[PDB]
Each structure stands twice: as C-alpha cells, then as structure tokens.
C-alpha cells in the first residue's frame, strides 16, 4: 500500500495492542530494570519462596486455581496454563482489531487463533524475561530461571527452551510498536494446516509485512536485515511449539491425573 497507509496501520495496531495487553514490553522492561516506585516484584527462587509468593494470595483475596496440597512442579505447570488461558483471550481480542480478520470464514478465524496463539504467547513471554527470570501475575512476582530449571522429572526443562529463545529474540531489541505489527503478521499466516480460504489471509498479511518493514526501517535504521532476522524467528517459534507439545505427551504418559484446562485441550487437539 501507500506509506501514509502503512503508518496508519502501524498506529492502529499499536493502540489496540495497548488496549489488549496490560503488561507491555515497556512496562515490563520498566520493572526488570528499576523504574517506577511502588513495588518491586516478589522474587520466587525456591519452594518456600514460592509458598510466600503463593500464600501471599492466601492473605490476598481467594481467586487461585489450584491452591497447593499438590506438589511444587505441578502447581507451577498449572500456573503457566492459567496464565496462557488469560493470554489466549487477550490475543483473541487483538486479532479482532486486525482489519479484515472478522470478515474471514469463521472456521479460518479459529484456525489462525489455534495455531497462532502459542507462537504469540512465546513471543510476548520474551518481553517479560531477562537472562535470570520472568515476571508473573501482572508483574507482582519474578520467578527465577534457576528455580524453574531445577524442577523434578520432566518439568525441569519446560521453560528452559523459552528462555533460550527469549535471549536471542530480545537481541533484536524490538519495542511494543514493532511487536504489535509482528504479532498480527503471525496471526494472519496462510500456511496454517486446514485453512479454507488462503487468498484473503495472505492478502492481509501482505500489507502487514509491508507495514512491518517500514516500521522497522524508520524505528531501526542502523539495524540491518532486521526484517529478515525477525521473520526467521517465525520458524523458531514453530519449533518451540512442536517441542512443547512433545513435552506435553510425555507428562501425559508419566502423570496419572494430567488434566489440562478446557480451552487448552481445545487448542492442543490435532495441532502440529
């Protein structure tokens, strides 16, 4: 399209991105560094500390969704699941703000969410991570990488791959306006298994890609081949998702009472 258009699209996306996602990379980064005086995240680095961060909600109001009694490893696993349930909702809302998306075949809309959701969650998860940990619960806590990595049986390495991706991803130093465009690019992927009408989708992603390139050229002039490097991450995300799915099969085989949240079972069924 035309420049003025690509820039408007960029601005449109950024705004609904601010509207749909509470802890932006900006706010996130604000916390992991030092900015904003009000409350530093409560650091969870071991069993007792988890307890303190957890049972803090015990003082706090009773919302939770698995108040212990069930081993450390599983409480954290179920916590990620619930955070993911929130995320799919924030993501679904953003998707609806992307021009021409709700005008697509309803079955194609769901397929895009089905395969795009986890790729986005892992992309945005990076915004909340540094080399030592990830912010949790709207940034009220900070769970260390060493603690997650020490979990028992198969849970010991369910986050380590995400951290590794985050390290390289953050190396591109994108900001929320860059991310807002990229996420949309991910959602509007014409290669998802099972799509009925590709043409409409690729036509929309085509414009989003042009917007992203311009956005990156203007917002990152000295960053060379950033556009290409960023699209390459789309293949990495693909791997983190199949790898996590494989890890899910394992848990299912070694954990007697697995049980996955309904919205998640819905997404993981017949996936890739």
């Amino acid at each position: 399209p035309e420049s003025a258009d690509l820039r408007a699209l960029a601005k449109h996306l950024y705004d609904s991105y601010i509207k749909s996602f509470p802890l932006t990379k900006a706010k996130a980064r604000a916390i992991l560094t030092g900015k904003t005086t009000d409350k530093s995240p409560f650091v969870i680095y071991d069993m007792n500390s988890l307890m303190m961060g957890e049972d803090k909600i015990k003082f706090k109001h009773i919302t939770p969704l698995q108040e212990q009694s069930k081993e450390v490893a599983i409480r954290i696993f179920q916590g990620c699941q619930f955070r993911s349930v929130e995320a799919v909702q924030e993501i679904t809302e953003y998707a609806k703000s992307i021009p021409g998306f709700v005008n697509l075949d309803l079955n194609d809309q769901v397929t895009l969410l089905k395969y795009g959701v986890h790729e986005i969650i892992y992309t945005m998860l990076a915004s909340l991570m540094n080399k030592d940990g990830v912010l949790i619960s709207e940034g009220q806590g900070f769970m260390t990488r060493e603690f997650l990595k020490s979990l028992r049986k198969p849970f010991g390495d369910f986050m380590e791959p995400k951290f590794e991706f985050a390290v390289k991803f953050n190396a591109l130093e994108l900001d929320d306006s860059d991310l807002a465009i990229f996420i949309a690019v991910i959602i509007l992927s014409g290669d998802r298994p099972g799509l009925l009408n590709v043409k409409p989708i690729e036509d929309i992603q085509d414009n989003l890609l042009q917007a992203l390139e311009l956005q990156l050229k203007l917002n990152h002039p000295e960053s060379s081949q950033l556009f290409a490097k960023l699209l390459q991450k789309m293949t990495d995300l693909r791997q983190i998702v199949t790898e996590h799915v494989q890890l899910l099969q394992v848990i299912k085989k070694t954990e007697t009472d697995m049980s996955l949240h309904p919205l998640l079972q819905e997404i993981y069924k017949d996936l890739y």
């Binding site: 909702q89 679904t92 809302e93 969410l113 819905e266 017949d270």
Partner: peptide, 16 residues
C-alpha cells in the same frame, strides 16, 4: 474438533 470455546471468545468476547 469444534473449538467451541474459541468461537465464544471470537463472537462475544471475554466476560469479567
């Protein structure tokens, strides 16, 4: 497959 819950979110959105 169906994905009934995704449909809900797409159609009506998220409640409080």
């Amino acid at each position: 497959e169906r994905h009934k819950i995704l449909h809900r979110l797409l159609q009506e959105g998220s409640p409080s």
